[PDB]
Design a protein around this ligand. Structure first.
Ligand SMILES: [Cl-]
Lengths: 206, 206
């Protein structure tokens, strides 16, 4: 199938950034949900999971695991990875910061309830004082609609996804970043993104 | 300077994989060690650290942070990232597995002493039963000297580095993987790698 096939639980988890990037690229995709231990064991026994873990994406004859490998391939394939290696260096630097903050926020519910408060205060401080200032500064410096190269790249999508999660986590964290507010509304208005934001899409709930 | 400039503590930590890749590529580099809080604050105040953290590498007019961004740029620049995006997909999938295991092993000393035993047993199980079998299988399947494309790529260097750390951590973990033993000796014998393995190089101690 030329539709990529996404193997994961029926949940956001580690697959959601790949759903976002495919949706932004206008690429229809199929999901095969892991609903049982037998589902996972079959993928493992069939040799489909190089390190016995999901996300796995079947695409272009490959069985790709590791979300960073999956995202890199999708971004290159659909021209969302910039035009040269210096542009990719900016995209990667920006993207890695976003993934680090996203990981901290996701880790809050996997962490035991008695440490969730302490890691929540830390995640909020890092959001307000380390990560969002860096991206506000990028947008303020060049004044362009997109993070890199004055055109849509993968990291605009990664940032929108993060901004949506911040709004779920604590909407007040966004109030002091006006260029990021405007960015969120702009990227949300891209036709493929608008479609993915609508109820009924493959976007997964919190 | 066309020598890249590596900003970090005088320690392996998160900079060592970049030292390895530059050394394997035959690229002379300069180190500027953070020896004081003033050193770090200056980098931060001067706007050199996008997310206020090191590693940072000055290269080709850029101030690159996030080790994955740094490594991606160095690999592309010095032709250690394969020849097409499908080859990069394999390189990335392999590399991400290696980084995940390396992180677990590094985390053992940062973790408090009273949990080091439990995470050590887990790291050893993952080494023996998840990660090293995957790479033994890659080498066994194609029987070639290198992981990807039958030529040296970044991930051969990442794997050698991991194999050296496994040998420090618990040398018995390697005994059942004969193709990985042979791989370690082969990659160690590359002229640029031999040089980096010699006492007196910029390779950092444990
Ligand atoms: Cl990457």
């Amino acid at each position: 199938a030329e539709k990529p096939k996404l193997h994961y639980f029926n949940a956001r988890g580690r697959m959601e950034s790949t759903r976002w990037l495919l949706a932004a690229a206008g690429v229809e995709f199929e999901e095969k949900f892991i609903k049982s231990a037998e589902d996972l064991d079959k993928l493992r026994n069939d040799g489909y999971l190089m390190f016995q873990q999901v996300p796995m994406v079947e695409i272009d004859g490959m069985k790709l695991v590791q979300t960073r490998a999956i995202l890199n391939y999708i971004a290159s394939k659909y021209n969302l990875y910039g035009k040269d290696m210096k542009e990719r260096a900016l995209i990667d630097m920006y993207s890695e910061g976003i993934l680090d903050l996203t990981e901290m926020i996701i880790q809050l519910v996997i962490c035991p309830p008695d440490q969730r408060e302490a890691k929540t205060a830390l995640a909020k401080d890092r959001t307000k004082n380390r990560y969002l200032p860096a991206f506000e500064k990028v947008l303020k410096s060049h004044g362009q609609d997109y993070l890199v190269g004055n055109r849509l790249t993968r990291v605009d999508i990664h940032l929108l996804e993060l901004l949506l999660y911040v709004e779920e986590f604590d909407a007040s964290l966004l109030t002091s970043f006006p260029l990021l507010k405007a960015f969120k509304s702009r990227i949300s208005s891209l036709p493929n993104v608008k479609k993915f934001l609508q109820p009924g899409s493959q976007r997964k709930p919190a």
